Amino acid sequence: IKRIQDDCPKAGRHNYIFVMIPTLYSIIFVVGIFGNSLVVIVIYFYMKLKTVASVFLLNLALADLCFLLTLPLWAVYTAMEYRWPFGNYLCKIASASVSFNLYASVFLLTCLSIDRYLAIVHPMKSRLRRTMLVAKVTCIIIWLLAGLASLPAIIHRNVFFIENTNITVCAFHYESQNSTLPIGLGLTKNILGFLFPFLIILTSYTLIWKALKKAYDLEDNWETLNDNLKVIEKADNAAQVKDALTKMRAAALDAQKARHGFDILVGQIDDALKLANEGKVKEAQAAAEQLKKNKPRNDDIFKIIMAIVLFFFFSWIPHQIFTFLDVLIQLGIIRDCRIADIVDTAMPITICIAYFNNCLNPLFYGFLGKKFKRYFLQLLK
Template structure:
């Protein structure tokens, strides 16, 4: 990989110029980054503090939500640098190390965030659809092992993104940018294949596969809850709150990531068909900062969807804001605990119905 970084700071000439360089981007995007930074830092810090101080890491879902919030915080600390980079007209003043680190953390957060959301979806599927059989697998120990595996796997996937980024001098505009390495004569083919692999994995493992798993889990969860609701003949119960939360989680995930993934896929197509695509690249490079803003907003939405929807989380948040002692009251169960209890009752109802039907058939 050392050959790829050789000569990274040498000046290069751009075939299409600085595409996507518009004044409104340099003004609007840094403002959005700043809002994402403030909202995300406050929201995720509250999630970490509430879970650690009051709700504890004693449930599987709490472990995943805690790690998800830490992942978002790790990424959010880089947003001021990206805001500065955009506000100064794509000029990177922070050096090569922070360029690689920030780019790597952005990709790292993409994978960790989506992997933790997927782990939460699988956990909720097991808790609601298979509450009895999944008990031995849904333990805090297994959850922590899963988190370690997610961190390591995401680090491995994001490492190439960090290594293929560096500070580059643009001769035409005399600008120093933090960008993907420009291929030279000796490493052009190798770098092209590596960049294509990174883009392909980002689309496949960073969105398509996790999204398919999440949708499948939530559809099966919804079907189970609706069946239980139909059997119990209840109109407004706890199932409705759970279904609304699951729908909000899927919708937030979809809306935040789809725009970026669409333009990322178009960018991948331009890489597969090398040549002068200046008009297409102009559209992609102009839209990409805004799709990144929307994708980064997912780090702000996560605390709202997975934390603030829960009534007990809000109670514990008020205790935190009032600086109530940890032992002052019994810790409230997380929303996932309520979901597990609910799913166990729903499963019992379904099982009893099946047994009764079988008994009648025998008679």
């Protein structure tokens, strides 16, 4: 193999890392194999793939299982103080499997979020364009775009013999001069692997947020009119009628700001306000009674949309920042071996956060479906 020299040989070589990080990879392995296997068993065998979201959720669990197969290799690798005994062929597959799963899992969530924007906001107009054939062709393109993105992890990932410590490792060699590796390889994982997809994931669920808000606020406006109309019928003085009629005029304007006679209702409420203000109590109740039910509603859907976005953001944002810090060292913006140590120490920590939350994504998205939750609890019971 090749014999190279490490600029900062003591960077990232800490005993608490060589003991804790392999333990974390074991926790991710057992939980990941357990959770992602049940997702495949429930979807592919108990539901037979009947929707577009089921195709994405199936491939989201299959992609995580492929990454978990290479996880025991990295566990014993970090356990032996970064020593690679599996050869040069097994590293190119392992390093590609991690890069492949990063792009694939994030691309699937991007398309799954776009599917939710169309299924909730445009149910009738986007149904003929969202079929089973489209979901399968979308996934095979995602497999190609992820494999194309993990392509440098197959070409430039070689096994090197470090002469400083006589330790055989596999890595990218950020040569100071005459390097065949691309300059900004970590930049691709930033924009293509996080920045661009997150802005689509954030935009999709924000439009779902705004659509459900206009629909829920409209129902509360109608519920305000009906509840206040019953207050006027049960009122006994002009003060109670004045309070309910003012709340109905305000609710009519909010319901109008969601071509017809909304000004007719608002004008007739304003006519009733002219009677209740002049001490007339019985006359205002007659005009209110002359003017003027079981829809599903989940007021906790906004907490769900909030959790979905922040779970994708806070899980990847530790790994994507130190990835960007790795690029600054590669370009030559920073050459200090002190900041290279805090980057080499925090990289195993961020991977244990991003890839642990990512292996629980097919399980969390499954529990949102009421039918999926039914089959999942039957297997455990």
